Amino acid sequence: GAMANHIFVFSTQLANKGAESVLSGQFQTIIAYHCTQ
Amino acid sequence: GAMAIYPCGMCHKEVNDNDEAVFCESGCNFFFHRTCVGLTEAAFQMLNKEVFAEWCCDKCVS
Ligand SMILES: [Zn+2]
Ligand SMILES: [Zn+2]
């Protein structure tokens, strides 16, 4: 589906948490994680 | 072009073609060693792999 942007900006902290989320199975991509805050 | 060395924004040492590195696209225009900024190996792989994703240094965030 549709997305609010074509660039999602990650700080180191945010990228690290997002990657944890994906390895957990909670999300499929760090982009999905980003969209929920 | 001109022959140059691109220093890490953290440690100020050379970032070369076999370093694992990121680039701040939000303003400072510095390359950084992945290690110097605290990026996990997994976060680095996922940023690089996701075409919609972009990294930012701590100074440029605000
Ligand atoms: Zn460095
Ligand atoms: Zn920066």
Author numbering:
A (entry chain B): 317 to 353
B (entry chain A): 743 to 804
Sentences reproduced from the published study:
Pygo proteins promote Armadillo- and β-catenin-dependent transcription, by relieving Groucho-dependent repression of Wnt targets. Their PHD fingers bind histone H3 tail methylated at lysine 4, and to the HD1 domain of their Legless/BCL9 cofactors, linking Pygo to Armadillo/β-catenin. Lgs/BCL9 proteins are adaptors between Pygo and Armadillo/β-catenin, binding to Pygo PHD fingers through their homology domain 1 (HD1) and to Armadillo/β-catenin through their homology domain 2 (HD2; Kramps et al., 2002; Städeli and Basler, 2005). Intriguingly, fly Pygo orthologs exhibit a tryptophan > phenylalanine substitution in their histone pocket-divider which reduces their affinity for histones.
To resolve this, and to investigate how the deviant pocket-divider of the Pygo PHD finger affects histone binding, we solved the crystal structure of the Drosophila PHD-HD1 complex and examined its H3K4me binding by nuclear magnetic resonance (NMR) spectroscopy. Although dPHD-HD1 is far less stable than the human complexes, we obtained diffracting crystals under several conditions, which allowed us to solve its structure at 2.7 Å resolution. An important structural consequence of the W > F substitution is a significant widening of the T3 channel: this is bordered on one side by F773 the phenyl ring of which is less protruberant than the indole ring of a typical W pocket-divider. This is partially compensated for by a T > N substitution at the opposite channel wall where the bulky side chain of N790 protrudes into the unliganded channel and thus narrows it. Abutting the F pocket-divider in fly Pygo is a striking groove, walled by F773 and E767, and floored by the aromatic ring of F765. This groove is not seen in human Pygo in which a conserved L (L345) fills out the equivalent space, substituting for F765, as already mentioned. Key for the interaction between PHD and HD1 is a hydrogen bond between an invariant T in HD1 α1 (T328) and W797, the PHD signature residue (Bienz, 2006). The topological equivalent of this allosteric triplet in the fly complex is W797, L781, and V764: W797 and L781 engage in crucial interactions with T328, and also connect with V764, a residue lining the T3 channel.
